[PDB]
């Protein structure tokens, strides 16, 4: 499968990221069992990435573009849209489905 987006709290429902914009987000990343492997909130610094430059996993590129500014959403990402068969040594196992709690703070 691809990426599923499940809403947690609504945004403005009007402003969606376009290609080339910088997305400023807080996020928490968890394995399918619920173990957290990454979180911007723990570092007290939002994460920025430019949509369309493939600086993040495909699931983020397609999932976050579906969010409006101010929305918090749950992205469930299958391995093909994520770290795939390889995974990431000692962080993400092979063939892992990931769950991201993501809040789109603003666009730049």
Curated annotation (Swiss-Prot):
Protein's job: Keeps in an inactive conformation TGFBR1, the TGF-beta type I serine/threonine kinase receptor, preventing TGF-beta receptor activation in absence of ligand. Recruits SMAD7 to ACVR1B which prevents the association of SMAD2 and SMAD3 with the activin receptor complex, thereby blocking the activin signal. May modulate the RYR1 calcium channel activity. PPIases accelerate the folding of proteins. It catalyzes the cis-trans isomerization of proline imidic peptide bonds in oligopeptides.
Family: Belongs to the FKBP-type PPIase family. FKBP1 subfamily.
Designated name of the protein: Peptidyl-prolyl cis-trans isomerase FKBP1A
GO molecular function: activin receptor binding; calcium channel regulator activity; FK506 binding; I-SMAD binding; macrolide binding; peptidyl-prolyl cis-trans isomerase activity; signaling receptor inhibitor activity; transforming growth factor beta receptor binding
GO biological process, one term: negative regulation of activin receptor signaling pathway
PANTHER family: PEPTIDYL-PROLYL CIS-TRANS ISOMERASE, PEPTIDYL-PROLYL CIS-TRANS ISOMERASE FKBP1A-RELATED
Organism field: Homo sapiens
Principal subcellular localization: cytoplasm
GO CC, alphabetical: cytoplasm; cytoplasmic side of membrane; cytosol; membrane; ryanodine receptor complex; sarcoplasmic reticulum; sarcoplasmic reticulum membrane; terminal cisterna
Gene3D superfamilies from the UniProt entry: 3.10.50.40
Cited InterPro entries: FKBP-type_PPIase (IPR050689), PPIase_dom_sf (IPR046357), PPIase_FKBP_dom (IPR001179)
